[PDB]
Design a protein around this ligand. Sequence first.
Ligand SMILES: Nc1ncnc2c1ncn2[C@@H]1O[C@H](CSCC[C@H](N)C(=O)O)[C@@H](O)[C@H]1O
Ligand SMILES: Nc1ncnc2c1ncn2[C@@H]1O[C@H](CSCC[C@H](N)C(=O)O)[C@@H](O)[C@H]1O
Lengths: 257, 268
Amino acid sequence: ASAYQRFEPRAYLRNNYAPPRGDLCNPNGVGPWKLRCLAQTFATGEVSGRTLIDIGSGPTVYQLLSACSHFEDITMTDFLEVNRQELGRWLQEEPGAFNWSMYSQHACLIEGKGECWQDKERQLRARVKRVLPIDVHQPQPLGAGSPAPLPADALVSAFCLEAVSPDLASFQRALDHITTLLRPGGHLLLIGALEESWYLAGEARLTVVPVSEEEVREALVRSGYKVRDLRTYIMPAHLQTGVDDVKGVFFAWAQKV
Amino acid sequence: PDSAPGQAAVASAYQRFEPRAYLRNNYAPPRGDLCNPNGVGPWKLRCLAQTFATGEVSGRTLIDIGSGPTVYQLLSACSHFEDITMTDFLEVNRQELGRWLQEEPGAFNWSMYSQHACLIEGKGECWQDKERQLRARVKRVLPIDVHQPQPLGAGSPAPLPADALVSAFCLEAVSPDLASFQRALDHITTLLRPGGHLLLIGALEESWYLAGEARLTVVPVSEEEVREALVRSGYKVRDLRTYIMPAHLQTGVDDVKGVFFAWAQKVG
Ligand SMILES: Nc1ncnc2c1ncn2[C@@H]1O[C@H](CSCC[C@H](N)C(=O)O)[C@@H](O)[C@H]1O
Ligand SMILES: Nc1ncnc2c1ncn2[C@@H]1O[C@H](CSCC[C@H](N)C(=O)O)[C@@H](O)[C@H]1O
């Protein structure tokens, strides 16, 4: 796991959220797809409550753009301090922060409530109350005396679990671990790569467990989830850019029984 | 009785018009604040988008009358016309457009407007595609004087007659009085084909505005005077709506009391 110690936030953002993967203009791309799954799910009105926790946020905030308008108390997390630092730079409008505005705009476009992207960001920054350390390999991922209001009404996690797990079983356990933070009847929005085995973050090469959609489905089940929705996006050739070997992306809406 | 003097005053005044100050005064916040849907900015765009959304205003050629240094007035139009002529009396304004067309950084930044237009047209178009289409479709930027019987001049490049006209805050801003306004309206109407459409936006009951040093005179007009002039020019008025300028948007840059938007279709 020491690999994550060389993990470079800026190179990750560059490899994953700048063009071409970051070009949101084309509806057929992966960016628009991720935002679409997130927006559609919240527009249902069925994922609701007061507190939400984002698992393995890394240096990215897009995974909460549609979420922030349904949850007044949001908790962001990551294993790496550099990532938490990088998040602070955006939440605080500090210098050299990452530019997420194309995403705020597209979330506003997709949601179709006529909202200006600045209001969207304003609300997100306002509702993220804390950025906490987290280790999903631990039975209590957040630790013992966490400031985060537990249990959460809902969880989000994107491209974390499969990316921090050596194999299927470790993936399963981590899902078990985060699930304990989720209140019964609560909701989980799980996003991640399909059949991926490595990706690069500057000097770091990270190992990934290659999971399939049926494997994701079954794990959610064995964790005590009812799968409300599971969709797949197949990675087009032009977005296979040498920064990894992800074949596709899955999105899961699941509900703790 | 004799139009030259007033027209002469007008041209004289506009020699001091400062495009950057005008852009700031009218299209930068608070008026450029597109987040507040009760604001004048969102209303202008909404009037435009909804009209084009009917599918009822289309064709090949469009001419924008008195563009000045602004492009927001063409954001919803540009998907409906493949040939767009832009126009202004002042070279400096035309130079400003030229700067946006070349996509220079020195240019006024209209992307908030492009975004918002994309937002309310509701087709999920990204703003960079919106802008790229506008840039591609503007075929020319021409000098114009609406007080001339032939506003574009003799033997213009413009494809005439156009299928549609846009004109925003021009006529009233350059007409000393109502009869001048009416005449200007008559003049631009010759550039439009019968059965074609005019989208007219303008200030209501405005007598002055600032554009840097220049303090320019506007004929104050009412909604009914606008309607009558349209009828007098040979249009059917399809739509005429009004926006009242909220106090918080009255900022000492002018004395506009409200804004009007007219959708009118030339008879023939
Ligand atoms: N043992 C662990 N427990 C929880 N998160 C971990 C972890 N080891 C690494 N991580 C974090 O897992 C993330 C994988 S990539 C970041 C994903 C981000 N949410 C996005 O959607 O793009 C990195 O931020 C990494 O630092
Ligand atoms: N005699 C004339 N004929 C046509 N346009 C004129 C004119 N005299 C001045 N103008 C232009 O009328 C404009 C008024 S300002 C409105 C500009 C822009 N359409 C907007 O929507 O903000 C200025 O650009 C001015 O240069």
